[PDB]
């Protein structure tokens, strides 16, 4: 891999611990490079502020974060018409399981079928 | 919200597909009311051909329509003075971003900060 989508949605008190995971599994896939799109209300600002620590751990992964609001799902499932992933991680907590799994979903066909890790659909 | 703000800048092939996202975002904004301002070349006639079918599905929204050639966006600006609007919503392509883009930037404080929905902006 040397592409990874990355999805994450999770309450805000769990983007950290989320976060160094992500980054954890991204270097275990081979790739150096990652794009990390998160559904959440909040501001960039703010989760930056939040993921510190997390960021901090991996200055030499080449990621970029996207952040989408839940009506704007739409513009991120448009954009991935434009991707060249090769592979697909996705996180969540049990109270956005529901929402995450409606947007895995609808991913086109050739980057779901690249899933390489599901921490979300199957947490109690 | 009572009236809503809509600005849309498409190629003609565009406006029955985001004419559907225009009245599912009005009606989720709570207003049953709407001004939509369309940046295009076509006519009122034409138009409202292409949009029947979204015109017809919501009838219970309450509409007026707009249509502005891209030279006559300062007479738009001109009347948005004396529009009572609450909400604003934005919408279009790749080939409109730069066009709708300025736009938005040029809008009053107070209408910028009602943003309810922006398919234009992160567009990739």
């Given at each position: ?15 950290e ?45 080449g ?39 409606k ?22």
């Open positions: 891999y040397k592409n990874i989508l990355t999805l994450i949605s999770v309450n805000n008190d769990n983007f611990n989320y976060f160094r995971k992500i980054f954890l599994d991204v270097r275990s896939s081979g790739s150096k490079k990652t794009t990390i799109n998160v559904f959440t209300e909040i501001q960039y600002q703010e989760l930056v502020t939040l993921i510190r620590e997390a960021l901090l751990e991996n200055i030499d992964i990621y970029e974060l996207f952040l989408w609001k839940k009506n704007e799902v739409d513009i991120f499932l448009k954009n991935l018409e434009k991707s060249e992933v090769d592979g697909l991680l996705v996180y969540c907590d049990d109270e956005n399981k529901v929402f995450m799994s947007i895995v979903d609808n991913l086109p066909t050739a980057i779901k079928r690249n899933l390489i890790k599901d921490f979300c659909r199957k947490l109690s």
